[PDB]
Design an enzyme around this catalytic site. Structure first.
Site, PDB file in Angstrom:
ATOM      1  N   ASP B   8       0.930  -1.273  -0.008  1.00 22.38           N
ATOM      2  CA  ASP B   8       0.157  -0.068  -0.022  1.00 22.38           C
ATOM      3  C   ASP B   8       0.887   1.007   0.082  1.00 22.38           C
ATOM      4  O   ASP B   8       2.241   1.404   0.400  1.00 22.38           O
ATOM      5  CB  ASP B   8      -0.833   0.187   1.365  1.00 22.38           C
ATOM      6  CG  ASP B   8      -1.887   1.202   1.237  1.00 22.38           C
ATOM      7  OD1 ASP B   8      -2.295   1.509   0.236  1.00 22.38           O
ATOM      8  OD2 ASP B   8      -2.386   1.424   2.477  1.00 22.38           O
ATOM      9  N   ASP B  10       0.080   4.710   1.503  1.00 22.42           N
ATOM     10  CA  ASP B  10      -0.360   5.515   2.747  1.00 22.42           C
ATOM     11  C   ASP B  10       0.053   4.780   4.195  1.00 22.42           C
ATOM     12  O   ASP B  10      -0.584   3.562   4.119  1.00 22.42           O
ATOM     13  CB  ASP B  10      -1.701   6.179   2.862  1.00 22.42           C
ATOM     14  CG  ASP B  10      -1.815   7.193   3.851  1.00 22.42           C
ATOM     15  OD1 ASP B  10      -1.005   8.088   4.052  1.00 22.42           O
ATOM     16  OD2 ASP B  10      -2.510   7.259   4.730  1.00 22.42           O
ATOM     17  N   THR B 122      -2.766   1.035  -4.306  1.00 21.09           N
ATOM     18  CA  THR B 122      -3.361   2.364  -3.452  1.00 21.09           C
ATOM     19  C   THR B 122      -4.725   2.964  -3.640  1.00 21.09           C
ATOM     20  O   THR B 122      -5.084   3.147  -5.047  1.00 21.09           O
ATOM     21  CB  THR B 122      -2.164   3.131  -3.648  1.00 21.09           C
ATOM     22  OG1 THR B 122      -2.659   4.533  -2.671  1.00 21.09           O
ATOM     23  CG2 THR B 122      -1.946   3.755  -5.020  1.00 21.09           C
ATOM     24  N   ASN B 123      -5.471   3.270  -2.779  1.00 19.62           N
ATOM     25  CA  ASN B 123      -6.531   4.242  -2.754  1.00 19.62           C
ATOM     26  C   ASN B 123      -6.140   5.543  -2.696  1.00 19.62           C
ATOM     27  O   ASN B 123      -5.426   6.045  -1.711  1.00 19.62           O
ATOM     28  CB  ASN B 123      -7.642   3.899  -1.576  1.00 19.62           C
ATOM     29  CG  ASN B 123      -8.488   2.688  -1.969  1.00 19.62           C
ATOM     30  OD1 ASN B 123      -8.419   1.993  -2.624  1.00 19.62           O
ATOM     31  ND2 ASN B 123      -9.064   2.363  -0.686  1.00 19.62           N
ATOM     32  N   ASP B 184      -1.780  -1.340   5.768  1.00 18.21           N
ATOM     33  CA  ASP B 184      -1.973  -0.640   7.362  1.00 18.21           C
ATOM     34  C   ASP B 184      -3.380  -0.535   7.805  1.00 18.21           C
ATOM     35  O   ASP B 184      -3.547  -0.299   9.109  1.00 18.21           O
ATOM     36  CB  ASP B 184      -1.106   0.699   7.397  1.00 18.21           C
ATOM     37  CG  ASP B 184      -1.855   1.836   6.620  1.00 18.21           C
ATOM     38  OD1 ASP B 184      -2.346   1.641   5.489  1.00 18.21           O
ATOM     39  OD2 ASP B 184      -2.185   2.967   7.307  1.00 18.21           O
ATOM     40  N   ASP B 334      38.672  12.023 -14.295  1.00 20.18           N
ATOM     41  CA  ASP B 334      40.006  11.636 -15.335  1.00 20.18           C
ATOM     42  C   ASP B 334      40.050  12.385 -16.481  1.00 20.18           C
ATOM     43  O   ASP B 334      39.877  13.944 -16.278  1.00 20.18           O
ATOM     44  CB  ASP B 334      39.697  10.132 -15.896  1.00 20.18           C
ATOM     45  CG  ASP B 334      41.138   9.658 -16.540  1.00 20.18           C
ATOM     46  OD1 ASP B 334      42.253   9.279 -16.062  1.00 20.18           O
ATOM     47  OD2 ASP B 334      40.983   9.550 -18.070  1.00 20.18           O
ATOM     48  N   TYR B 382      52.370   5.010 -18.395  1.00 22.70           N
ATOM     49  CA  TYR B 382      51.244   4.326 -19.420  1.00 22.70           C
ATOM     50  C   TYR B 382      50.861   5.540 -20.398  1.00 22.70           C
ATOM     51  O   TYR B 382      50.395   5.225 -21.709  1.00 22.70           O
ATOM     52  CB  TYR B 382      49.885   4.142 -18.700  1.00 22.70           C
ATOM     53  CG  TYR B 382      49.152   5.354 -17.994  1.00 22.70           C
ATOM     54  CD1 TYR B 382      49.509   6.038 -16.634  1.00 22.70           C
ATOM     55  CD2 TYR B 382      47.927   5.952 -18.665  1.00 22.70           C
ATOM     56  CE1 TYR B 382      48.747   7.137 -16.620  1.00 22.70           C
ATOM     57  CE2 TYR B 382      47.189   6.718 -18.165  1.00 22.70           C
ATOM     58  CZ  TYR B 382      47.570   7.402 -17.034  1.00 22.70           C
ATOM     59  OH  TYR B 382      46.784   8.460 -16.511  1.00 22.70           O
ATOM     60  N   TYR B 465      44.957  11.775 -25.431  1.00 20.89           N
ATOM     61  CA  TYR B 465      46.278  11.571 -24.898  1.00 20.89           C
ATOM     62  C   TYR B 465      47.560  12.058 -25.824  1.00 20.89           C
ATOM     63  O   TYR B 465      48.735  12.124 -25.446  1.00 20.89           O
ATOM     64  CB  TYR B 465      46.590  10.045 -24.090  1.00 20.89           C
ATOM     65  CG  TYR B 465      46.037   9.552 -23.285  1.00 20.89           C
ATOM     66  CD1 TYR B 465      46.393   9.757 -21.826  1.00 20.89           C
ATOM     67  CD2 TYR B 465      44.998   8.813 -23.329  1.00 20.89           C
ATOM     68  CE1 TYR B 465      46.035   9.130 -20.741  1.00 20.89           C
ATOM     69  CE2 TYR B 465      44.338   8.413 -22.224  1.00 20.89           C
ATOM     70  CZ  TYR B 465      44.801   8.432 -21.144  1.00 20.89           C
ATOM     71  OH  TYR B 465      43.849   7.837 -20.020  1.00 20.89           O
ATOM     72  N   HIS B 523      40.822   4.572  -8.597  1.00 21.39           N
ATOM     73  CA  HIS B 523      40.609   5.409  -9.758  1.00 21.39           C
ATOM     74  C   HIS B 523      39.233   5.385 -10.258  1.00 21.39           C
ATOM     75  O   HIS B 523      38.898   6.497 -10.872  1.00 21.39           O
ATOM     76  CB  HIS B 523      41.846   4.859 -11.107  1.00 21.39           C
ATOM     77  CG  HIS B 523      41.325   5.733 -12.056  1.00 21.39           C
ATOM     78  ND1 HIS B 523      41.889   7.302 -12.228  1.00 21.39           N
ATOM     79  CD2 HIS B 523      40.845   5.687 -13.243  1.00 21.39           C
ATOM     80  CE1 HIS B 523      41.689   7.580 -13.222  1.00 21.39           C
ATOM     81  NE2 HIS B 523      40.925   6.634 -14.090  1.00 21.39           N
TER      82      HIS B 523
HETATM   83  C1  LIG Z   1      43.393   5.009 -17.322  1.00 18.33           C
HETATM   84  C2  LIG Z   1      43.773   4.765 -15.836  1.00 18.33           C
HETATM   85  C3  LIG Z   1      44.289   5.910 -15.209  1.00 18.33           C
HETATM   86  C4  LIG Z   1      44.675   5.996 -13.855  1.00 18.33           C
HETATM   87  C5  LIG Z   1      44.590   4.869 -13.180  1.00 18.33           C
HETATM   88  C6  LIG Z   1      43.711   3.475 -13.777  1.00 18.33           C
HETATM   89  C7  LIG Z   1      43.736   3.890 -14.939  1.00 18.33           C
HETATM   90  S1  LIG Z   1      43.582   2.205 -12.900  1.00 18.33           S
HETATM   91  C8  LIG Z   1      45.043   2.500 -11.565  1.00 18.33           C
HETATM   92  C9  LIG Z   1      45.128   3.714 -10.856  1.00 18.33           C
HETATM   93  O1  LIG Z   1      45.079   3.808  -9.888  1.00 18.33           O
HETATM   94  N1  LIG Z   1      44.953   4.830 -11.692  1.00 18.33           N
END
Ligand SMILES: Cc1ccc2c(c1)SCC(=O)N2
Ligand SMILES: Cc1ccc2c(c1)SCC(=O)N2
EC number: 3.3.2.10
Lengths: 546, 546
Positions: B8, B10, B122-123, B184, B334, B382, B465, B523
Site C-alpha cells: 500500500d 499510505d 493504492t486508494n 496498514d 579523469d 602508461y 592523450y 581510480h
Molecule cells: C586510465 C587509468 C588512469 C589512472 C589509473 C587507472 C587507469 S587504474 C590504476 C589507478 O590507480 N589509476
C-alpha cells in the site's frame, strides 16, 4: 561587390553601450569629466584593460586593477572618489542594462537571408562574475543568428591591432572590398578602412542602417514585420525515449526552465512548432516538441487501438517518467489539443498547465453514440471519410508533395471543403495535381514533411480518428470532473472545422479558463499567425505556468 | 511459494500516513475524537470520499464536500469548528509531510532484486491542487522501483471492493497463494486474505519487515547498506546533437532543474555515471551524461587533432548552444576532469560551477616540454605507451571483455602497474587472459562497455592523450588567469596515478576551491564509492550551484 557584413557588439548589436556608463557615472557622481574613461584605458596597449580584452586575465581579476587606476586618476586630478564607490556595481548594472539592438539584429538577419556571410567581431572579456549568466544569455541569443562570432579574449588579439582584421578576413574567406564593417568606435573602424573594407560609424541605428542599405542595395529599413526565428532540423537536439517494447517517442529539445511539451495535430510533426520552439526557449522555458505516436521518428504500430486516447495519454505519462519530469506544461493543436485536455482530466498531477490551439474541450455525450455526434455536424464529414482503413491512406500517400501543399494553406487559399468528402469520394478530388505553394510555407518546409511521411505514411496518423467508441467510453468516466489546473483556450477566427463558437461552453467545465483569440487565422495556427501565437503563449506561460 | 509482493502507499511505503492527521488535527484543535475521521468516511461506498477514490471527482472538487461533511458531523456532536478551519490547509500540510518510508522501499527493492514481481496498490485521488507537484514527485520516485502501480482513481475501483483484488491478480499474472500483501488498514487486508494471499498488517515498519522476511525467506532487515539506484540503458532518454558536419554528441538525460553536464574519463562511457544520474536527478538537477567525443554513440573521427582540448571544449560550448543552455555545471572524472578545468578557464560564462573527481588542476609549465613533464613522474608511463598510434589500440581491442575486467578493479584487486608499461611492452602483459570479475562490476555491466567499444574501438579515446604539445600551447595562454567561479576538487585516497597530493597547490589558482575526499577509493571513483560520490556532489551542488 559586398558579400559579408561584420558587426561590433557594444553600441552596435547591443545597447546602451557598456562604454558611456563610465561617462554616465561621472555625471551622476559629479566626478571630473573623463576620469573613469581615463582609468579604463590607462596604460593603453600594455594596460590592464588590453590584458583583459586579450584574455590574459578574467573580468574578476581586472576589477581591482581598474579600482587602482581610478585611485591614481583621482589623485592626479586632485579629487576624491565617493564613500561607496564600486567598479563591480557599476559594471554589473551596465552589463544587465545592455540589451539586443533589435533593428540592428533584424538588418543582420535580412542580409544573411539574402546570401551574405555575417559575423560579430568584438573586444570582450572572460566573464567569471557571479552574475555572468545574463551576458552568457545575451551572447547565446545573438550568436545563433550569425555565421561567425570573433571575440578578442578568445583570439588573443584586439581591435584596432591590424592582425585581428587579417584574422577576420581569413575567417570570412573574403577580400576586403567584399566586406561592410559596422563599429561605434572610429579608431576601431580605421584599420578596416585602411584595408579597403566599406565601413560605417554607428552613432544612431537609423542613420547606420540608411548607410548600410545604400551600400548593400538591400532594403533594411521600413521593412514588413519579420517572421519569428524558425528551426533548422539538423541544428536541433533530438531526443528518443522507449515508452514500451515496440514504441519509441522522438522529440526536439531546446531551452532551460519549466518543461513545456508541444503536441502537434493531424497530419503534422514536431516541425509544425518551428516558429514557437526558439521563442518559447528564449522566453525561459525548456521546450519538448514531440513527434506524436504514428509520426516522423516516433514509432508507428499498425493497430488501431494503439492510438486510442487512453493509451496515448498513458504513453505521454511514461515519457515524463523516463525523462525524470514530475510535470510539464502541455500545449496541443488539433488532435494534440484533444490529447492535452485528456491529460488535464486524467493526469492533473503531471500537468503543470494546459493550453489548446483551436481544439475546444467538449465533454462526451453519454446519451449519444460518438458516430451520431460526428454525423450531426456537416464540417466533421472528413472524419467519417477517415474511418475506413486504407481509403484515406491511399489518397494521402499517393503524392506526398500534393497532400501537404493542398492541406497547408491560409484561409484565403484553400481548395479543400471538409463537408461532403465521402460524397465527393476524397479530400483532394476537386484539388489540383500541382497545387501552388501557400504563402505560409516554403518548398523546403513542404519537402521536410514529405520526407518525414515517407517512413510510416498515414496509417498511424489516421488511426487517431479510428477510436471514437473507445475514446467515448473512457471520456464518460471523467463526466463528474472539472479542469481546475491553469488552462488556456486559443480560438482561430477562420478555422472552419474547429470554429471559435464550438468553445463557447468550456467555462462550465473549466471555470478559471483563460482565452486567446487570433483574427484572420485558419486551421494551421502555428504557421499562419506565428508572431501572435508566440505572444499569447508567452504571456500565458509567464502569468500561469511560472 | 511466494513470487509477488504488493504494498500500500499510505502508512506503508509513505509515512506519516495522511490518515491519522485527521486524528492529529482533532487533538490539536480539541475537537471531539473521531469527528474529522467520521466526516472523511461519511456515506461510505456512496459518499464523497469513495467518489474521490474512484476518480469520479478531483481532490479540489472533494474539498468543499469534505467541508460540508465536517459541518454536519460538528452539528450532530453539538460542537463548533474553529474560526480559521481549513480542510485544504490540513491536507496540504499532511501530503507535504508524508515522505517515502525508506526501509519499506529497500525491502521492496531487495524482493524485486531476488526475482519477485512487485506492485503498489493504492486508494488515491486525482490531485489538481496548486501544490500537486510535491505528491507527483513522490509518486515518480516510488513508481520507478516497482513492476506495477495500481491506483484506485485510475481503475475506478477501491479497496476493500473484491474486484480490485481480482484486477491486482490479473495484472500480477499470479495465483493468490503466490502473493504477499502489505497494508496498514485491516479492513483492506481482509479480501486479500479471503482470496488466500499472505497478508501483513503494517503498524510499525520493523515488525512488518520481520513478518515479511519470515514468510519470504529473504533477509530484508539488518542488511548491508545498498548501492544507489543504477541506470537501465534502454529506459533512459537518449539525446543527439550535431556540433559540426562530421561530429554528433550523444548523451543520456534525466531530471529537471539546473543543467549538470557529466564528463567521463578514459576509456569510459556515459554509463560510468550510472549511480550518479538517478541520485542527482532526484536531488533536483537536470542531468546530461555525455558519451565524450570518440566514445559510445558519439562520433569518433580518426584524426589526432580532433581530440585536442581546444577543439573538445569548443564542441562542448556548441553542444550547450544547440540545446539552448546558457550554462551548465560541469562535472568531470579523469580526462573529463581535465576538460572541465579547461571549460572553467576558457569559457567561465558558460560554466555555472566546476567539479573534478581525481584529476587535479595543474597549470602548464611554460619552461618545460609536456613530454619532459610526463617523463618526470614514473606513474605517468602508461601515457608514453599511449603515444604511438596503433600500439595501445591493438592491445586494448584484442579482447574487450579482458580489457574492461583488467581495468575496472577496486584498489585491493588490481593487476595493472601503470609504471614501466613501455618496458613491459603493454598494459596487460602480466594480467590474466580471463580476469576475475571485480566486486565493483557485474558481468552485464562489463558487457555494456564491451558492446559500446565494438563501434569505434580505442583510436578516438587514445587520441585524447596524443595532443600534449597542442594542449600545452593552448593552456599557456591561460597562465595569467585564476578560476574564480564555484569549484570542487574530489580526491580519491587510493588512486595511484591521480594521487591526492598532486592537488596540493590548487588553491594558488582556485582560491575559493571547495574539497571532498574519499578514503579507500581507487581510480574508478563513481563505481568504487557511489554513495560517497553522491553525498559530496549533492551537498556541493545544493550550496554552490543552486
Ligand atoms: C586510465 C587509468 C588512469 C589512472 C589509473 C587507472 C587507469 S587504474 C590504476 C589507478 O590507480 N589509476
Ligand atoms: C485536418 C484538418 C482539420 C481541420 C481543418 C483542416 C484540416 S484545413 C480546413 C480547416 O479550416 N480545418
Amino acid at each position: 561587390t559586398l558579400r559579408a557584413a561584420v558587426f561590433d557588439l557594444d553600441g552596435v548589436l547591443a545597447l546602451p553601450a557598456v562604454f558611456g556608463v563610465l561617462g554616465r557615472t561621472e555625471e551622476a557622481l559629479a566626478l571630473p569629466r573623463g576620469l573613469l574613461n581615463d582609468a579604463f584605458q590607462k596604460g593603453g596597449p600594455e594596460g590592464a584593460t588590453t590584458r583583459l580584452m586579450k584574455g590574459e586575465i578574467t573580468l574578476s581579476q581586472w576589477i581591482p586593477l581598474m579600482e587602482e587606476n581610478c585611485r591614481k586618476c583621482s589623485e592626479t586630478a586632485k579629487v576624491c572618489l565617493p564613500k561607496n564607490f564600486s567598479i563591480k556595481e557599476i559594471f554589473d548594472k551596465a552589463i544587465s542594462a545592455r540589451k539586443i539592438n533589435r533593428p540592428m539584429l533584424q538588418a543582420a538577419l535580412m542580409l544573411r537571408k539574402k546570401g551574405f556571410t555575417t559575423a560579430i567581431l568584438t573586444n570582450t572579456w572572460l566573464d567569471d562574475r557571479a552574475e555572468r549568466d545574463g551576458l552568457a544569455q545575451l551572447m547565446c541569443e545573438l550568436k545563433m543568428h550569425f555565421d561567425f562570432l570573433i571575440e578578442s579574449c578568445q583570439v588573443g588579439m584586439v581591435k584596432p591591432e591590424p592582425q585581428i582584421y587579417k584574422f577576420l578576413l581569413d575567417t570570412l574567406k573574403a577580400s576586403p572590398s567584399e566586406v561592410v564593417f559596422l563599429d561605434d568606435i572610429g579608431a576601431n573602424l580605421k584599420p578596416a578602412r585602411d584595408l579597403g573594407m566599406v565601413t560605417i560609424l554607428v552613432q544612431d541605428t537609423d542613420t547606420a542602417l540608411k548607410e548600410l542599405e545604400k551600400v548593400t542595395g538591400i532594403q533594411l529599413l521600413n521593412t514588413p514585420a519579420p517572421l519569428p526565428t524558425s528551426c533548422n532540423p539538423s541544428d536541433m537536439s533530438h531526443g528518443y525515449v522507449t515508452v514500451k517494447p515496440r514504441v519509441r517517442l522522438h522529440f526536439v529539445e531546446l531551452g532551460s526552465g519549466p518543461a513545456v511539451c508541444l503536441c502537434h495535430g493531424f497530419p503534422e510533426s514536431w516541425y509544425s512548432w518551428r516558429y514557437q520552439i526558439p521563442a518559447l526557449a528564449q522566453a525561459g522555458y525548456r521546450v519538448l516538441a514531440m513527434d506524436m505516436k504514428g509520426y516522423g521518428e516516433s514509432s508507428a504500430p499498425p493497430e488501431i487501438e494503439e492510438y486510442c486516447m487512453e493509451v496515448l495519454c498513458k504513453e505521454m505519462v511514461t515519457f515524463l517518467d523516463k525523462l525524470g519530469l514530475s510535470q510539464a506544461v502541455f500545449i496541443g493543436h488539433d488532435w494534440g489539443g484533444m490529447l492535452v485536455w485528456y491529460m488535464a482530466l486524467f493526469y492533473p498531477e503531471r500537468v503543470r498547465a494546459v493550453a489548446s490551439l483551436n481544439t475546444p474541450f467538449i465533454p462526451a455525450n453519454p446519451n449519444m453514440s460518438p458516430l451520431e455526434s460526428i454525423k450531426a455536424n456537416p464540417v466533421f464529414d472528413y472524419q467519417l471519410y477517415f474511418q475506413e482503413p486504407g481509403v484515406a491512406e491511399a489518397e494521402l500517400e499517393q503524392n506526398l508533395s500534393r497532400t501537404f501543399k493542398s492541406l497547408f494553406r491560409a484561409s484565403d487559399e484553400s481548395v479543400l471543403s471538409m463537408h461532403k468528402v465521402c460524397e465527393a469520394g476524397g479530400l483532394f478530388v476537386n484539388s489540383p495535381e500541382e497545387p501552388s505553394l501557400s504563402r505560409m510555407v516554403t518548398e523546403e518546409e513542404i519537402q521536410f514533411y514529405v520526407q518525414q511521411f515517407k517512413k510510416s505514411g498515414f496509417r498511424g496518423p489516421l488511426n487517431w480518428y479510428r477510436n471514437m467508441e473507445r475514446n467515448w467510453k473512457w471520456a464518460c468516466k471523467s463526466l463528474g470532473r472539472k479542469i481546475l489546473i491553469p488552462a488556456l483556450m486559443v480560438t482561430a477566427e477562420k478555422d472552419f472545422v474547429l470554429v471559435p463558437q464550438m468553445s463557447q461552453h468550456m467555462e462550465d467545465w473549466i471555470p478559471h479558463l483563460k482565452r486567446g483569440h487570433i483574427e484572420d487565422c485558419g486551421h494551421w495556427t502555428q504557421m499562419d499567425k506565428p508572431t501572435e501565437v508566440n505572444q499569447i503563449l508567452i504571456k500565458w506561460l509567464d502569468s500561469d505556468a511560472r
